Structures are given as C-alpha cells and as structure tokens.
Design a protein around this ligand. Structure first.
Ligand SMILES: OC[C@H]1O[C@H](O[C@H]2[C@H](O)[C@@H](O)[C@H](O)O[C@@H]2CO)[C@H](O)[C@@H](O)[C@@H]1O
Ligand SMILES: [Cl-]
Ligand SMILES: [Cl-]
Length: 373
C-alpha cells in the first residue's frame, strides 16, 4: 500500500488492539474526512526502514520505544514537538523513553511490563520464587497439569530471570549507556539462564514453547501459570479462566527485573501527512476516549496519559504491572538494542535447545554485542 497525502496508514503489532485503534481512526475520518487504515504486518519493526524510503510504509508506526533510536539514527522519524499543555498531559518518564539525542522522536502511549499470570482455581497461592517451581510442577504433573509455560522463543520473556541476579544490557552511569560495558555473560546472567535451562533439563518446561503454545495452554486451563503482558489479558477474559496478575518470582532472593517497554507512536519522517498524524495522535488517540477504545480491544497497560491512567491504576492487574515495572528497568532506546536483542535471542534458544551450554551461549552473545558496539 502506497503512502498518500490525505490518508493515514498506521502500523502496529499483531498482539495489540488494532481493531480498537481502527475505531479511533473511524472517528477521525468522521471529523476530518481522512481515511485511516490500520495494519499489523509481520516483522513490522524490521520492515520499516526500507518501506519508509520506497514509499510503501506507514505514516505512523507503533512499537516499544527500544527500537526507535536505531530508527532516528537512520533519519526515519519526524521530530515530535508538542506544546507544553499537551506535554504536561503525559507522565515525564514516558517522554524520557522517547527522547533521543535531545529530540522527542515519538509519542509515548503506554508502559508495558511482564507479570506472573496464574490460574486461581489450579493455584490459589502461587510461588514467590523460581526455586519453588520444580516441586510445584511435579505436583501438578500428577494431575495432568503443568506449573508454568511462557514464550521461550523471544528473549523479552526470559530477560526478567536473566536480569534478576545481575544480567544487564548496557551499563548505565551518569545518564549515559556505556556501549562497551555489556552484562549478558556475567555471573548474574549465567545463573538466571542456568536455572531456566535446568527447568527444561528436568522436564518442567519444554524448549519449544512459543507465544501461541503458552497462551493456548494457559487459556485452556492446562498450565497453572504464564508470563505475559497486559495485551494478553483480553484473550484470558474470553476463556473465563479465573486468573490473577502478580509479582514475578524472585531468584536467589532477588526480584525478577523485566525490561519495561513504552509502546510509542512514531511519525515517518517522509510522511506527506505529518500534521494530520500529529492531529490524530494528540487530539484523537491520546485522549481518555481514544485510549479506552484501544484498551477495550487489547489492554494497553499503564497508559502514558495521566487522566486515563488515574482510572486504570485502580485495577489490581495494573498495580501488579507497575510493581513489576518498578523492579525492572526501562529499556534503552539506543541503536545497539537491535544487536542486543538478536544476540540474546540466539543465546536463549541455543541454551534451551542444548545446542550450546549456557556458558558458551552467553559468552558468544556477549562477544557479538560488544564487538558490534
Ligand atoms: O524479544 C525481543 C523483543 O522484545 C520486545 O518486544 C516485545 C514488545 O515490547 C511487546 O510489546 C511485544 O508485544 O512483545 C515483544 C516480544 O515478542 C522489544 O520491544 C523488541 O524490540 C525486542 O525485539
Ligand atoms: Cl523532523
Ligand atoms: Cl510462595
């Protein structure tokens, strides 16, 4: 689909509320005459650089903020310059996540953090620790159930455990990330992934489990727990599993530390519709009504808009989200995050499969990330 003056094309990931977003687009069109088309292509975060230059891309792109520094480095993102009245409507820490080399490069939408989701009927008192999960699984196995299933194919979901005892991406000191100081093969990182691989070795998890398999198992009442973000809650509502949302398990006494993402809306620097895009985002999406439409489709998490978040904060699933966020850390947005995620993806998949030892998988990932910085 070709970008065109007088229409808006929006890209957002397939696990988000694109139908709720399309409803906001319908209100925009009712007021302005401007058609808004929402798409959720596969690997949209990887396709965006090419199509921006060829003309086949979106006016507006949604992703977690960690991807946006690499986009800005390549010139792909229009600078965002809201008036103070609008800026004041969103939490300052969300604007911080979309600031890159002194410019705002997107609008923040909502704060995402993984939580432990658990079946209250199978497991009224979920474990506080990772160490408790093997024996819990053993008991559940004798009932033809399992303790825990989550996506092992995306490193996003395993990172809270790796980080718990000391793993980190890039060392952060005095407001700057030291791209030479990577923490993916330190003792903390090794201990977390070793624990995960030992679960697999002892048949308390399966190396092959992905997003679909874990969501299906939890929503069919086959596993007592999953790890996932707020977007998953609506499919769980539909299944009417009785579920809670709670703090992630500790490891070696330390909290799991999920990498926190700010879902953000960037404007294609080459869009012929930059003003319309700002008009849509500031006056239609980032309002109580616009976010509620999306949120009702797939829950956004802790939205960046203060007025609406004051309502959402009363939901215990949102408070659990923010507690896990506070124990974790905001992702960097620096361009090196792409290589970080690719290298750690390989390391988790190879360690979990037994293709490599934990120590060699993380050492190779550490080396790749460092040499590429
Ligand atoms: O697994 C590496 C990717 O992790 C995050 O992607 C998250 C994203 O924040 C969340 O909204 C989405 O729905 O789940 C994915 C994991 O599949 C980073 O935002 C990505 O840049 C990383 O590639
Ligand atoms: Cl610009
Ligand atoms: Cl417990």
């Amino acid at each position: 689909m070709k970008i065109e003056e007088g229409k808006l094309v929006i890209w957002i990931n397939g696990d988000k509320g694109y139908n709720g977003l399309a409803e906001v687009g319908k209100k925009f069109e009712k007021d302005t005459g401007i058609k808004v088309t929402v798409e959720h292509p596969d690997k949209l975060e990887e396709k965006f650089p090419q199509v921006a230059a060829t003309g086949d891309g979106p006016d507006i792109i949604f992703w977690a903020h960690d991807r946006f520094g690499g986009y800005a480095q390549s010139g792909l993102l229009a600078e965002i310059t809201p008036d103070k009245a609008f800026q004041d409507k969103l939490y300052p820490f969300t604007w911080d996540a979309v600031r890159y080399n002194g410019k705002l490069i997107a609008y923040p939408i909502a704060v995402e953090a993984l939580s432990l989701i658990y079946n209250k009927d199978l497991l009224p008192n979920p474990p506080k620790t990772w160490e408790e999960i093997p024996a819990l699984d053993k008991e559940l196995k004798a009932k033809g159930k399992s303790a825990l299933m989550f996506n092992l194919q995306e490193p996003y979901f395993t990172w809270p455990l790796i980080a718990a005892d000391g793993g980190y991406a890039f060392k952060y000191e005095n407001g700057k990330y030291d791209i030479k100081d990577v923490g993916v093969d330190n003792a903390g990182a090794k201990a977390g992934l070793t624990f995960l691989v030992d679960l697999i070795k002892n048949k308390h998890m399966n190396a092959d489990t992905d997003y679909s398999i874990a969501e299906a198992a939890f929503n069919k009442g086959e596993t007592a727990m999953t790890i996932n973000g707020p977007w998953a809650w609506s499919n769980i509502d539909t299944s009417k599993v009785n579920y809670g949302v709670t703090v992630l398990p500790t490891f070696k006494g330390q909290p799991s530390k999920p990498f926190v993402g700010v879902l953000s809306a960037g404007i294609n620097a080459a869009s012929p519709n930059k003003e319309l895009a700002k008009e849509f985002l500031e006056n239609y999406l980032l309002t109580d009504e616009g976010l509620e439409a999306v949120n009702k489709d797939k829950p956004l998490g802790a939205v960046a808009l203060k007025s609406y978040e004051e309502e959402l904060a009363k939901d215990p699933r949102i408070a659990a989200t923010m507690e896990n966020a506070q124990k974790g850390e905001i992702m960097p947005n620096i361009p090196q995050m792409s290589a970080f995620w690719y290298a750690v993806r390989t390391a988790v998949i190879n360690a979990a499969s037994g293709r490599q030892t934990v120590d060699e998988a993380l050492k190779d990932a550490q080396t790749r990330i460092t040499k590429l910085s």
